[PDB]
Symmetry: C2
Subunit: 84 residues, 2 copies
């Protein structure tokens, strides 16, 4: 399993979720992280993110892919594909 996590979280609560995912997935651009995970770690990411975030206000989308998808990037590549 491979997932791309994109999120819209109000400031002064974003930095919090950012720190969290930085220890689970790779940071692609602002508000975007992706990486491989185990059916267990996947539950853990969403587990913590479930309380590290405030529903009703924030939004988090977690696409569930089978492998690292190809991508086309414009502008300053927030992170070299190789570096991950």
């Amino acid at each position: 399993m491979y997932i791309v996590v994109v999120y819209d979280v109000g400031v002064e609560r974003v930095n919090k979720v950012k720190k969290f995912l930085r220890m689970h997935l790779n940071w692609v651009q602002n508000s975007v992280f992706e990486g491989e995970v185990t059916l267990a770690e996947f539950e853990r990411i969403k587990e913590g993110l479930k309380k590290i975030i405030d529903e009703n206000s924030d939004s988090v989308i977690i696409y569930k892919l089978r492998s690292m998808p190809p991508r086309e990037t414009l502008g300053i590549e927030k992170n070299p594909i190789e570096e991950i």
Copy 2:
């Protein structure tokens, strides 16, 4: 082809790219659009987005998938899966 477009564009230039993608793809959450496209329309989205945005500063990631990926959403679903 199906793509998920995520972007980080400075304000007062974001609204511009937002209007553009709203006429090409579906809006999932803030800074995220996805939808099906033809090898032609795909070139068109990135074509316009290529000049509707300022490199060196902005960042745009366009994942290239074969079909609408499954997703897990937390918080206020910025848009019902069915509504698209």
